[PDB]
């Protein structure tokens, strides 16, 4: 399949080189996989999600996304126009309030929720979770991300937007999950992207067009935008039979474009997510 004039991030993920605008992907498109988006929630009714999005959990007075951030993330995972996995099921878990804040305790409960809740969903092809959130190092937060992963969910998490070493951030510093840095359209590290030996991969994170609340769209930036590219790519690869929750991060890093990014600090991986689709 070929989606012409795709958002640059989508084109990039299916390309060996920067500067192109068509997204190529196998038509299976993530069918029969599931992606949890753990964030401010998801405007499920957005036409772009086509009935494939559902809120399954909130810790606040409402499950609606009153912010937009989670909806944007969800659209990059799986909206028909802006998404990597155009046929995946999307499940929203609202651990962040409408100001995009959440206490660590709520975030942890949200991770544990998905680790059980995937047993209530139909995802023959596998399960992914996209966690575009972050705060200072906490072993409890790391440990919750590690449980989520060991239960059989491919966990992808934002490296953070501090332009600093991600070792100091959670769940970014958790070794067993996929920690995702942000790049821009000219293949430079995003200027806000964290870095470090704890990073596993980079995805498109600067000027990322996707869904927003009120049924609209917008371009925004962050390692939080890069994460759902990798989350969507895992779902897509898993439905193709290429990999599993337990090895998806590894496989993505093995099949990445390598040594193509600029401003990567000494000791951080120079790997850009890539679907290796032979159209
Ligand atoms: Ca990690």
Curated annotation (Swiss-Prot):
Cofactor requirement: Ca(2+)
Residues holding Ca(2+) 1: 175, 177, 200
GO MF terms, alphabetically ordered: metal ion binding; serine-type endopeptidase activity
Metal-binding among keywords: yes
Cystine pairings recorded for this chain: 34-123, 178-249
CC cofactor note: Binds 2 calcium ions per subunit.
Reactions accelerated catalytically: Hydrolysis of keratin, and of other proteins with subtilisin-like specificity. Hydrolyzes peptide amides
Assigned protein family: Belongs to the peptidase S8 family.
The protein's name: Proteinase K
High-level lineage: Eukaryota, Fungi, Dikarya, Ascomycota, Pezizomycotina
Gene field: PROK
Boundaries of the shown chain within the full protein: 106 to 384 of 384
């Amino acid at each position: 399949a070929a989606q012409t004039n795709a958002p640059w991030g989508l084109a990039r993920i299916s390309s060996t080189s920067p500067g192109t605008s068509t997204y190529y992907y196998d038509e299976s498109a993530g069918q029969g996989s599931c992606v949890y988006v753990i964030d401010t929630g998801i405007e499920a009714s957005h036409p772009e999600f086509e009935g494939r999005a559902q809120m399954v959990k909130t810790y606040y007075y409402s499950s609606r996304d009153g912010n937009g951030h989670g909806t944007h993330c969800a659209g990059t995972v799986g909206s028909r126009t802006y998404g990597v996995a155009k046929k995946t099921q999307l499940f929203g878990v609202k651990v962040l309030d409408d100001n995009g804040s959440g206490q660590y305790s709520t975030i942890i409960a949200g991770m544990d929720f998905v680790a059980s809740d995937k047993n209530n969903r139909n995802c023959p092809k596998g399960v992914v979770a996209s966690l575009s959130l972050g705060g200072g190092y906490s072993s409890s937060v790391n440990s919750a991300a590690a449980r989520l992963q060991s239960s059989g969910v491919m966990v992808a998490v934002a490296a953070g937007n501090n332009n600093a070493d991600a070792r100091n951030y959670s769940p970014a510093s958790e070794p067993s999950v996929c920690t995702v840095g942000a790049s821009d359209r000219y293949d430079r590290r995003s200027s806000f992207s964290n870095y470090g030996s704890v990073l596993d991969i980079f995805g498109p994170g600067t000027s990322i067009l996707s869904t927003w609340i009120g049924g609209s769209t917008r371009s925004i930036s962050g390692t939080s935008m890069a994460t759902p590219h990798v989350a969507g790519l895992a779902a897509y690869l898993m439905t193709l039979g290429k990999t599993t929750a337990a090895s998806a991060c590894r496989y993505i890093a093995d099949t990445a474009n390598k040594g193509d990014l600029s401003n990567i600090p000494f000791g951080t991986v120079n790997l850009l997510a890539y679907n290796n689709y032979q159209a």
